[PDB]
Amino acid sequence: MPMILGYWDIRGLAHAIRLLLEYTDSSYEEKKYTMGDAPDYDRSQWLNEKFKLGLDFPNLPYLIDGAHKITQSNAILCYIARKHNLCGETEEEKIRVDILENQTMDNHMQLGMICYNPEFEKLKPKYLEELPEKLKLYSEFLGKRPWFAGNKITFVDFLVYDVLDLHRIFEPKCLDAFPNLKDFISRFEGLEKISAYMKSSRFLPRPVFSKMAVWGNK
Amino acid sequence: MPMILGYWDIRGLAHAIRLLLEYTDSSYEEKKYTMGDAPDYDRSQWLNEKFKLGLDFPNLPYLIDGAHKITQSNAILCYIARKHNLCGETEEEKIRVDILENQTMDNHMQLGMICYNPEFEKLKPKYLEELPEKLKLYSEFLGKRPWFAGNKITFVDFLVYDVLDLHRIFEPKCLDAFPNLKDFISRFEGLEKISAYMKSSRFLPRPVFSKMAVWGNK
Ligand code: NA
């Protein structure tokens, strides 16, 4: 019965999924892949079973729940969310969820691109220069709402939390100009099932990225 | 009052949206922004309006429909699709829709990455070496189904059509090994409203990408 979540033994793209699985009290186990160390960074464990699990578009992370085999982190989150009415009910909520689902991936991928290239320190200045405007848009989108879709928490709160928390690790002061984002993080981490998970042995906040990353590899 | 689709005067990320608006007999008009040529690629036409349209995360394309102001092309597609029950009904359809919404963006962005890269000619051979396996995944996922979510067309058929068609422009023979994908294209282009639109003066198949592209800029 327990679902299987497959991913590298890192935080990465599985962080929001792990948090949502824990928030919804879902029964799951993790299939963990380990990347080899430098200089080769072997990925054989995944690449050689990548095509042996019945996934339609093999990729990490994946979720196996009975006959349902899902890839793409956002499709995984949506699947879990539908089981728990975490998807937005009003048309307004649904639009906000769809926008943020795609926007959070853009901003995550932009950080991933800066952290996997070797000129990271050469490219980091322009990134931090353009970062406050990115966070301001999140802060203004939230405004006075408790959650990003409106009055009710949805799966995109888990995506926005991950994006925000990644950046306060990346730059510790980046949220100081945005008190409503700091309060959002405080309220998210204070949710009973989330707080219990973050204080448990399963909590895997680091490394942020794979061994292949210039930043966040450890 | 027609909806407003705003984008560059190219095919780009708006193709699937244009096709879906046409299939659904939507009332819309297009706000076309023109981009300057190299090396500056002037976008001041967009920049002078970018923050004055009510968009939460200003970006192109956008869709304005009364009070609803939407960015992210997948969010735009979902908004139009919900008006016409084109998002999938059963859980099984919804999973396939969710996977494909994100998978098609992945493959779209992977072609965009090499076509916008200055070393395009250096990178093309390996991309073409890996292309058959990518398309095989779409062919095996479709199987003998008429549409990608199952027995009824959904908005992700428009997304898959665009990615496949982009690649037969890029590599004309690339679908030859996959008859069910060729048949799918025939079915998509054989929809009455798509057929009429493709013969219309509104059809805009080229340029594939923006003026900044190395491949597909004209
Ligand atoms: Na939808």
Residue numbers in the entry:
A (entry chain D), B (entry chain A): 0 to 217
What did the paper state?
Glutathione transferases (GSTs, EC 2.5.1.18) comprise a family of widely distributed phase II detoxification enzymes that catalyze the conjugation of a broad variety of reactive electrophiles to the nucleophilic sulfur atom of the intracellular thiol, tripeptide glutathione (γ-L-Glu-L-Cys-Gly). Each subunit contains an active site that consists of a GSH-binding site (G-site) in the N-terminal domain and a site that binds the hydrophobic substrate (H-site) in the C-terminal domain. Moreover, the isoenzyme GSTM1-1 is mostly studied in humans for its correlation with many types of cancer, while other studies support its pertinence with Parkinson’s disease. The present study aims to evaluate the ligandability of the human GSTM1-1 isoenzyme (hGSTM1-1) using a broad range of structurally diverse pesticides as probes.
To shine a light on the restricted hGSTM1-1 ligand-binding promiscuity, the ligand-free crystal structure of hGSTM1-1 was determined by X-ray crystallography at 1.59 Å-resolution. The enzyme was crystallized in the P21 space group resulting in four molecules (A, B, C, D) in the asymmetric unit. D–A and C–B form the typical dimers found in GSTs. The interface area of D–A and C–B dimers is 1341.9 Å2 and 1313.1 Å2, respectively. The interactions between dimers are mediated through helix α7 (residues 178–189). The most noticeable difference was observed in Arg42, which is involved in the formation of a salt bridge with GSH and points closer to the active site cavity in the high-resolution hGSTM1 structure than in its low-resolution counterpart. Indeed, the cavity volume for the ligand-free hGSTM1-1 is ~8.6 Å3, for the GSH-bound enzyme it is ~32.4 Å3 and for the GSH-CDNB conjugate the cavity volume is ~55.7 Å3. Since co-crystallization of enzyme/pirimicarb was not achieved due to the high-salt condition in the crystallization medium, a molecular-docking study was carried out, taking advantage of the high-resolution structure reported here. The compound binds to the enzyme at a distinct site that partially overlaps with the H-site.
